Amino acid sequence: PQTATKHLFVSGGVASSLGKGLTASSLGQLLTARGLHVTMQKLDPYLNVDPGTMNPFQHGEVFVTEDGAETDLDVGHYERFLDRNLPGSANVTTGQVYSTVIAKERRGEYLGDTVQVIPHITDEIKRRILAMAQPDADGNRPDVVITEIGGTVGDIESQPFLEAARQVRHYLGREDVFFLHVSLVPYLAPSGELKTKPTQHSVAALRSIGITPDALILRCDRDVPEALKNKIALMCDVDIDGVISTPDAPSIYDIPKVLHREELDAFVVRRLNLPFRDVDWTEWDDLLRRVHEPHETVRIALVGKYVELSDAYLSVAEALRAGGFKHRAKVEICWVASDGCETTSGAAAALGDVHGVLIPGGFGIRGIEGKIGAIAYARARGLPVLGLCLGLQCIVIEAARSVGLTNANSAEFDPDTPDPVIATMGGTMRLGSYPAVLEPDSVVAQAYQTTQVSERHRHRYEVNNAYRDKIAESGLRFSGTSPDGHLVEFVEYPPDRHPFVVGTQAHPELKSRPTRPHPLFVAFVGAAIDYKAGE
Amino acid sequence: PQTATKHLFVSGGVASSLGKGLTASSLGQLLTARGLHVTMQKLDPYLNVDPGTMNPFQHGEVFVTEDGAETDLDVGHYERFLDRNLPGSANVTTGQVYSTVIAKERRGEYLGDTVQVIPHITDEIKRRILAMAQPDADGNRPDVVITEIGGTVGDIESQPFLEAARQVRHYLGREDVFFLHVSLVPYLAPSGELKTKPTQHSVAALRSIGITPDALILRCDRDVPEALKNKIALMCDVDIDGVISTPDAPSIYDIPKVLHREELDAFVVRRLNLPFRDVDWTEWDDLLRRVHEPHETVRIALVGKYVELSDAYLSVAEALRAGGFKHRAKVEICWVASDGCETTSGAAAALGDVHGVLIPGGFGIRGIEGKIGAIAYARARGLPVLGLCLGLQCIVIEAARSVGLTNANSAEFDPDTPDPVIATMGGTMRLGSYPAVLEPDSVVAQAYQTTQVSERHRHRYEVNNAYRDKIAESGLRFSGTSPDGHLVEFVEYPPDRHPFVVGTQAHPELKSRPTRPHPLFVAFVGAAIDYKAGE
Amino acid sequence: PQTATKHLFVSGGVASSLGKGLTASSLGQLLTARGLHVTMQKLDPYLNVDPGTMNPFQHGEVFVTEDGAETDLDVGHYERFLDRNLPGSANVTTGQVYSTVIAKERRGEYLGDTVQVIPHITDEIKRRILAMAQPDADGNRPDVVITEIGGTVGDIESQPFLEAARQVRHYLGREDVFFLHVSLVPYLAPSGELKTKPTQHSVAALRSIGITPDALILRCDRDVPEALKNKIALMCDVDIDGVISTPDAPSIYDIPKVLHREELDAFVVRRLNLPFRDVDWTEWDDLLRRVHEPHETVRIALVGKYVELSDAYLSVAEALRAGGFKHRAKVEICWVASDGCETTSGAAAALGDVHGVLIPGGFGIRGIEGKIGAIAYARARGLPVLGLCLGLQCIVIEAARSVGLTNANSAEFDPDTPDPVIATMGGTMRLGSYPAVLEPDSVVAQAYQTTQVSERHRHRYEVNNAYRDKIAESGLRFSGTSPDGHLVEFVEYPPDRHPFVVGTQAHPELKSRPTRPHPLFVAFVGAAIDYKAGE
């Protein structure tokens, strides 16, 4: 039988860039491995109502849920570590709260009461939090909700969320609410010692707003001496079980071992009185083997538009590497800047060194001819290609230009093109999960091993249905469509035209999990390994 | 069976002069009435090592324990409300802590370690606190120690005591430590409403140092509306059982009823899990009757040296009134300034209106001839007299001068007197409890109904043992002595010389309790009532 | 003409071990180079009244002023960087304040007033501070007093000093008081960026007690980007002239260049309106040349009792290196643990690799036979020796044992010795500066180039004046004495017995300055270089 849904807030002190996200994700992973139905939530502090306005080349990708809600990329780590789909409710922001309360004000639904910050805003936040305890579409209720509070304790940027957390702690009571806390432990080079004083000043600032931390996670470049853990337990009044060393791990997938080796999760389960059951590593030891024991290295070029910040492609890169792990191959990514590839001599100079090329999406970018040139090169050179979203549109433009439709373009990039092979259906902006059907015994059907698939979408332009028969003169099969056949979903060249050249409009990288890689990235790495073996 | 000795700290916020002392005393009274063995402690913040240096005309009397320890007058309220003797350990000060730790430093008992404030000072304070849990001379261990932290939360004056309280709360755990808190609720006259915001800012300041208050006592001139108690429970995270209204009571003896009518003590007993048993009021309803239903008013003049601050005589005045309550009489005190009474015309102008005159002590004052003049008048007029300590020395000087020893004096006030009837035995400064013996069937023996008594002392001058036979020529009997007869303890005139004129060297006001008045003050009020009846 | 003496407080935030001492010393150096008469003061937080109780093997040496006041070793850096003698007033501690105020309380000099912490303590601290503005023994008044506040801002350990600083800032006014501030800027390895948030939280904590910092010194492992200096000036309201980068310098003597290259001192002079004059580097460029361009490396063994903490010998090591700089030689110190040298085979195994051996002091240690063995070896091997204080007593014991006084000892280490060549005169504990006279044309007289010297002392045992003629049978000349000849001050072997073997009772390392090395350490390094050249 299930008790009340516990809440487990996480807040950062001293500094940002300490890994609250991956730490909370790893805690969710461990609780999942015990068999609890964990779910997760992020409370972003910024006022953007949704991230579709944000420049991804500075703030990373935009994740898309099943229900087509745009969310912070941080939600991706929670999905990947849980292997669970999360609702669009998983990402609250200050912008959603303030614009909700001001909308209800203008519509007059507060009966003319004065709209204070307290209680109206903090009750709305508390409601957005407690909604996660509601039963899912199957009627199951989660055991634990982990809620990463954004910003830093003491930021004016976060005070309303921490007042809401305080109120939740009042109404549910300490049997059912737990606070983790994450804080920096700097190393000083002239003296050669770890200093706890910033963590004491952090927990003092946290207590000044009425939250009591039940455990500390100490972020450090070396294992914290027991002689400092005891001092922290003295000066923070944190039970000495709950001062946890957490070095900088070798890789993000090692962090669950770090947290388990300090036995954090056993203390969490004991403190919340959740149904205690043994951890089974059998699902994750094999991952750590594949991660640490690569049989071979294989290089994939990724033809990004701008590549000085790699975080703009995080989930693409992680989906590639998750594919690599399926073949026990260390996928290494050659970050290739598309604007170097607009000339075939530059394309040859960049791309000739690799065993495959991948065309990632690029919603909202301008100027794609570099990607088309890179694809035309890769076809002539025989390099395997996968095109994610804009990737399919560049592949289709390349195919049409190969059959002489020289001025062919997307209506997005040349509204005056005489041959809009990609055109607006601004037309219906498709978002979220839609069904698709595969040509039976197509190459994609051979990969998925089924005719029925579903994918997450974020595009408003489509293959012009009048051109399908013309484009098929290239040999390009339209090997998947909408169930009515009205919309194009996949394209491929035949197996004897090229070994593997596929595109989709989807973002298949969003269905990646390291224990369950996406079929197309597995097949693409299989083709890249076969190219390595043949060359 | 007895569990661990619980601790119950009390700290003030917003302001001083809020009645932490009488509130904590009344809580001790209620817990005593349940039958728990309560004991109490004050942690003064000032650096005076003992108060014997302090000017009592600005800071009130100096209390004296059984073991002769000088303590703050605040200890008197705890003794009176408990009716229990307290050790000299009942009053810690910062001066005792800092001078102890620096003494152990100079004696080298820290093995050359650096003497920080933490942990050395706060461990010493914690030791001075936990000492109260040690078994008494009978081997009984108290159930509850109530510890009034001096100053205000947020004073630099108190930070080390609050860090010590935090450490105690860590080592004993919240099952065994409770915090009361006392805070002001101002009334604003232009708007006519109570404001809780100062109490919120107080509990925020208290939390900033890591103490969590379990209940609030709200100090207000009117009953706090339930609509503000709920807001305080919301904004302070104080369980709504534990927000307690406490109006300004009519008198200090009514405060136990106030605390019981809001049912504070039931919540304390439930929260500490003490052995629950019913309150019996039978001991205190009769006090409240006597306090509120006086049959008659009787006036006593008290011949103080300086009287603009009455707190210098607190325990004298309270012992008088406790005597009054024994005869159901409202004792009203005519505060008479001794320097008006040095001339017989001024003495007649001041003292003629009253039914008795009392000569209080005056350790460390200069110039006493006003008191001698007042006594000579009172004798001629027939007014009953009691002399406390210096009172006996003025009575004895008056007696000697009445038998012509005209230049007789105390060696304290004229070291060059040719007739030191009071002289140094600086000689042995007597402090604390000493036995004395009474002349059988003396007037004092008729009052005490026994030959054996004990009293608390604070004097270094004594009746000159060579003059006893000479002074007895006045008829003044030396009706009590040390058991060896070496020292004078009491004097009286015979019943047919005057109705009641007695002195002692003792401070009998320190053995006052309202449920157990001191015998001499009962007899003195009996004589003053008989004078009222006869006149 | 001279205006009022300015005050320049310095306080640390975020962490200790950030170099407030050397930073403030370097600021004093720069202001001295401009020609201002700077003086300095340390306000230690610990309650040790003087450090003579402290274990130096954990807290470093004890410095000794001209007037024989024991002070924290931190005073040594101020003396060395100023090249000025400082009074014993240069080191206040909480122990001196609290024991002073409690002494005046017990002596009754507060007229019975209650001794609060405020104002009595903080007025005493303010008085101890303002005393530094009083004219010196020549009647000159310093222009600037630099006052390093100990502990960290927000420590209960320091609150009274910061309240005193606030009061001084009130009474003198912001024209005449300046606050530096020192704060950490951590580097985070996973993200690769400097984080300013701990400095913002520091300056917030500092402002919460009413001090406004006029400049920030940022302590970092790399030059702070201008893009973070501007953010700090925004969020701290620090004038952007006054956010100063300070990397970890290569050596302590380079820090004046760091502070001058960021032009801190020009801003300080402009802000305090001191008499502006150009910096002259001519005194310090030659030091930095000698420091960075060593012609040769020469190794000196230092025979310490315990050597795992080198800070116990700080001023000895610095005096050696200052001697090295006089010959342009990199002195490298072989830290030799004396207990390895008690056997001649172990002595040979340790000491044979070096060009000289030095016997440092050791007040309060037990067991010296290792040092005697090391000296007997060094004599047989011909290694140059210098004995500081206990060094002379080991040299003298070795000399006496070489002439067959086999059971000779110091009365300190064998009170039952039949031959106390070193004996109590506990006798007079000599402290501070005393005159001494040198044998004309002695080797020491050839070094000092004068007959008259003075030295700082800290010993209570002396050469037994009855044994001088007996010990001189070794050839050991008693080449210096008290001016009356009563006390032994120096010993030497003749130039043809050994090249240079000298001892003293003094601590000559305390008169070291890098621009003015002590004559004996120059001569000793000259002899060690001559041994290197000959071997």
Ligand SMILES: Nc1ccn([C@@H]2O[C@H](COP(=O)(O)OP(=O)(O)OP(=O)(O)O)[C@@H](O)[C@H]2O)c(=O)n1
């Ligand atoms: N136990 C941890 C914690 C953090 N990191 C490193 O810290 C970086 C930060 O990644 P992230 O969790 O996403 O935090 P940020 O995006 O940088 O900033 P924020 O704290 O707001 O989440 C990661 O690259 C990760 O390698 C790590 O290796 N191990």
Ligand SMILES: Nc1ccn([C@@H]2O[C@H](COP(=O)(O)OP(=O)(O)OP(=O)(O)O)[C@@H](O)[C@H]2O)c(=O)n1
């Ligand atoms: N809440 C606190 C914490 C520390 N101190 C004082 O700060 C000094 C110690 O300085 P510091 O070394 O910098 O802090 P640590 O406790 O020792 O931890 P860390 O090593 O990280 O510095 C001690 O005198 C200690 O009493 C204090 O008064 N109040």
Ligand SMILES: Nc1ccn([C@@H]2O[C@H](COP(=O)(O)OP(=O)(O)OP(=O)(O)O)[C@@H](O)[C@H]2O)c(=O)n1
């Ligand atoms: N529930 C209360 C609390 C306080 N008082 C009044 O508050 C005054 C303060 O007396 P005391 O307890 O001794 O406090 P102070 O001496 O004035 O100052 P402090 O708080 O430091 O004890 C008393 O006269 C008392 O009448 C009261 O009548 N009822």
Ligand SMILES: Nc1ccn([C@@H]2O[C@H](COP(=O)(O)OP(=O)(O)OP(=O)(O)O)[C@@H](O)[C@H]2O)c(=O)n1
């Ligand atoms: N911790 C708090 C407490 C109050 N407020 C805000 O302060 C305003 C109320 O002002 P005020 O009346 O002065 O405080 P009250 O809560 O109403 O209590 P009181 O009547 O004593 O004033 C409200 O907007 C409330 O949201 C806040 O932002 N944060």
Ligand SMILES: Nc1ccn([C@@H]2O[C@H](COP(=O)(O)OP(=O)(O)OP(=O)(O)O)[C@@H](O)[C@H]2O)c(=O)n1
């Ligand atoms: N601008 C600076 C500041 C500090 N340090 C290094 O920091 C160390 C600290 O020395 P010190 O000034 O004496 O400080 P601590 O003794 O370690 O501790 P505290 O802050 O209390 O003085 C020194 O070894 C020094 O090399 C430095 O190289 N350059």
Ligand SMILES: Nc1ccn([C@@H]2O[C@H](COP(=O)(O)OP(=O)(O)OP(=O)(O)O)[C@@H](O)[C@H]2O)c(=O)n1
């Ligand atoms: N006094 C302040 C300081 C910062 N913030 C908020 O904190 C967030 C920035 O987080 P962070 O990067 O960690 O602090 P920085 O100012 O950017 O400095 P640093 O790089 O060291 O982190 C911003 O939303 C900013 O508005 C705030 O609300 N109040």
